[PDB]
Ligand binder design. Structure first.
Ligand SMILES: O=C(NCCc1nc(Cc2ccccc2)n[nH]1)c1cc(-c2ccc(F)cc2)cc(O)c1O
Ligand SMILES: [Cl-]
Ligand SMILES: [Cl-]
Ligand SMILES: [Mg+2]
Length: 214
């Protein structure tokens, strides 16, 4: 008390413009470069995310892991009018920071926070949250959950031909089982985007895995 996440939110509120997502991203990146490192996707990998979002213009995006809402703000600002982001966050303190971050950025109408474990929420998406299929999934939660949640998404019928999975941290901390699985599966077309760990001179990367159907 206070936490790093509360300090990041306060910094944004006092160093960005309300309703200006770009200024929010810049404020978070400045804080995390100059004051305290935090596990936001960051600008380096964020620019790759931007390129992917702009290519596919997804109407419905699922994010696994919100943290402080950096990637939610990053993706939501590039969504077309009426397009929507659902973000799953198990940590209630993170969920509170993310909501306030979205509110400040003026993106609250485009993004909905789902509270709970992804393994509990994913099976509820169709009946409770009126989802048919997902256009894109951003994986950025517990690294050992990338593979089981991907398999659960398929089981629940939430993936379609062309659904884009984009996974953060496939190098550091790394997601070896997920990476081996999607790269070895005929149901995925994979591309690796080499980059750097947020705010650090350390190699990381994103994996894009496009679902091909069964
Ligand atoms: O752990 C990370 N992220 C998960 C954060 C998170 N966990 C939740 C709980 C939740 C659970 C289930 C479902 C939805 C949410 N929400 N958000 C993460 C770590 C690092 C990193 C750390 C130390 C280091 F030395 C190097 C790198 C870098 C990263 O980019 C990351 O994303
Ligand atoms: Cl993030
Ligand atoms: Cl960065
Ligand atoms: Mg990450």
């Amino acid at each position: 008390g206070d936490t790093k996440e509360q300090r990041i939110l306060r910094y944004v509120q006092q160093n960005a413009k309300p309703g200006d997502p770009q200024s929010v991203l810049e404020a978070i990146d400045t804080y995390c470069t100059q004051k305290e490192w935090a596990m936001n996707v960051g600008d380096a990998k964020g620019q790759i995310m931007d390129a992917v979002i702009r290519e596919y213009s997804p109407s419905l995006v699922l994010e696994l892991g919100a943290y402080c809402g950096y990637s939610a703000v990053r993706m939501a600002r590039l969504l077309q009018p009426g397009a929507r982001l659902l973000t799953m966050e198990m940590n209630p303190d993170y969920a509170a920071i993310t909501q306030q971050m979205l509110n400040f950025a003026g993106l609250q109408d485009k993004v909905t926070i789902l509270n709970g474990a992804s393994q509990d929420l994913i099976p509820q998406l169709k009946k409770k949250y009126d989802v048919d299929t997902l256009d894109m999934v951003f994986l950025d939660h517990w690294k050992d959950r990338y593979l089981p949640d991907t398999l659960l998404l398929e089981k629940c019928g939430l993936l379609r031909k062309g659904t884009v999975l984009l996974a953060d941290n496939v190098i550091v901390p790394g997601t070896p089982d997920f990476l081996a699985y999607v790269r070895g599966s005929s149901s995925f077309e994979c591309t690796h985007y080499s980059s750097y760990l947020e705010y650090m001179k350390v190699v990381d990367g994103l994996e894009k895995a496009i679902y091909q159907g069964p």
